[PDB]
Symmetry: D3
Subunit: 142 residues, 6 copies
């Protein structure tokens, strides 16, 4: 399994809801931090893609490391969208802080890099004030 004190999701989460970047970077973690506000999902997917190539998290060349992040993002959007992966076209909108990790979370080195996308903030109507919290975490091999 994974290590009792280096569980990548639990980290990516504990970080996102606590103001950090430094202690984690000192271990194997290629970390990334973010914020997107949109009523389009294709917007959130694009932001995350950029911040991930922009900081050290994902190789900008090729499809491989990309394809990992796309599906890891979808997955996180699930917890967020809770059933239909739609925002504005369902008359809703999001204020999100995204956190993204990469490193090996398992005991054996043969396990390679794994990517975690965490998403936290709020979902509600286009008019600010009308919202509750939302939450999505996704995990893929990279």
């Amino acid at each position: 399994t994974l290590h009792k004190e280096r569980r990548i999701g639990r980290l990516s989460v504990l970080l996102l809801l606590n103001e950090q970047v430094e202690e984690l970077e000192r271990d194997g973690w290629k970390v990334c931090l973010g914020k997107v506000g949109s009523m389009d999902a294709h917007k959130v997917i694009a932001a995350i893609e950029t911040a991930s190539k922009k900081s050290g998290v994902i190789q900008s060349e090729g499809y491989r490391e990309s394809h990992a992040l796309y599906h890891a993002t979808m997955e996180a959007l699930h917890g967020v969208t809770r059933g239909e992966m739609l925002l504005g076209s369902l008359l809703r909108t999001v204020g999100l802080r995204f956190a993204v990790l990469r490193g090996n979370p398992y005991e054996s080195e043969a396990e390679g890099d794994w990517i975690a996308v965490s998403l936290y903030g709020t979902i509600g109507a286009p008019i600010k004030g009308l919202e509750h919290e939302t939450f999505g975490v996704g995990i893929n091999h990279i």
Copy 2:
């Protein structure tokens, strides 16, 4: 709006993720409940939670109103865990899950009433040994 000290999702999740705790949250005006469930049946996960939340009186043991908000909240969170098909065993996967239910008012205006949050953390994977990754789910509903 959501008052920054009382972000109900955030509190409930922080609670689950930290080994160390409840007693502090009760003092502020929070009904609280924790537990564990491991299963290949999503129904056992729902049931354990409906159970824990009633024995420890986060919601009433009788009536329907409160059971309904909790059902829909659990359903919501199980979205995080399952990511597209709310199935475990029938898609050959299983979960080892801690959960928290957290009840109070996260809104500045005290005429917003109570709200419920249900959070789920643990692993999801194949039935074999340690063939799994982490998994997570939060669901919020007016109660």
Copy 3:
């Protein structure tokens, strides 16, 4: 165009809510089924429509149409995930299946409507609310 006097959905639903159509063009059946299993709800509907003359007992064409229309109806009932006991909820349903042509165009042929009405909730009565679904297909 839908012939406003003969709307196969509206009719099938009104039927479920009340406690005739055969003399107009309609083939009609009604039934009851309570389950923690969706497959049984599907099966009860299939069986009841075959016992009466709503869809022919033989071949696949008419069965396939009833299959899908039932599914579409279950979408109304289940509201995101087409699962019952499997998510610790349960159903007590009446159903109707109507068949006949709702369009002016007599070219349009027979259509099917599958309507589902009842309650969905916890295993325990009263810990439940109402539930509805309609599925419409060509046949």
Copy 4:
């Protein structure tokens, strides 16, 4: 328990299916009816929100009652959309009427107010005539 003389779903569906006399107002029900045609699901949501707010079905102030109605409409749209909550985006359009009811349908007054969203009308191709009926009913506590 649900009392046969007051099934909120049943009533809203009956009202919507007939052709003006109120007398549902005569008991404790708050009610409205509407018409809306769109190829946009968000427009449908907005209409029903607006119409319930421009009468006194749900309060225009605060998040709670907006939230319940939001969700009831989402549920209701399931029956209508049957799998993907997409309209013009999947090349289809709706002609709907709708009714929203709010009241205590349970014997025990402890149950408080519940809401029901009913939708009836057509779904078909962007041309009128190429369409069939469609129905969604959502029920939530409020």
Copy 5:
């Protein structure tokens, strides 16, 4: 049941896969149609297929019946392509597809009437140049 040579599903997929049979299909009694379409909108794909299917007389241009069948068989085929959420552009992705639409009776029993298959093949990936893997999708309806 279906026969070994007149299995509509496969034939229609197989047709798409050899860039090389259309006439060979027609001498048998299949009514068939080949196409290509690229887009970031799901609706465009449906349109492409609806149009080509009416223009070359796979289905009646007049009336609803045959349209309704087509629509749902396309709906089905798009699940394979889209694998969970039936969005393209609105979920940051786009498609290049050939499509085939086949009509006739894949059964001994001739009282089954006509059935219809819609097969889609191309790729899927980002709007960007060359980020793409393959994609697939078959829908089957009575017609």
Copy 6:
């Protein structure tokens, strides 16, 4: 992008829809695997395929990494087969499938590594077999 005459989907698919030729694929860089499963449980379909890809050389039997890709590539292929709800028996339908599994690199450079393709073909229909129609699904993941 892709090398045009080693497109992993079409290969596995042509492979699957064609009743030796394994060896042809094997003689290039392909790890390749075939098999058959009929079930009213999706989990049996996933399981058969995990086992067949492990018994042959197709994926490493030790660890999680390769299983997670194969798990997911399968989910994706079953989306094609099942079309909205990834349920068989609990929706009173059943499958008789045949499956192909391909592994290797089908892109320009070899920095792209291995990718996997799980391709499904067969029928779906009522628990009384015979009353059926065809089915198809293709899942593509990196490995």
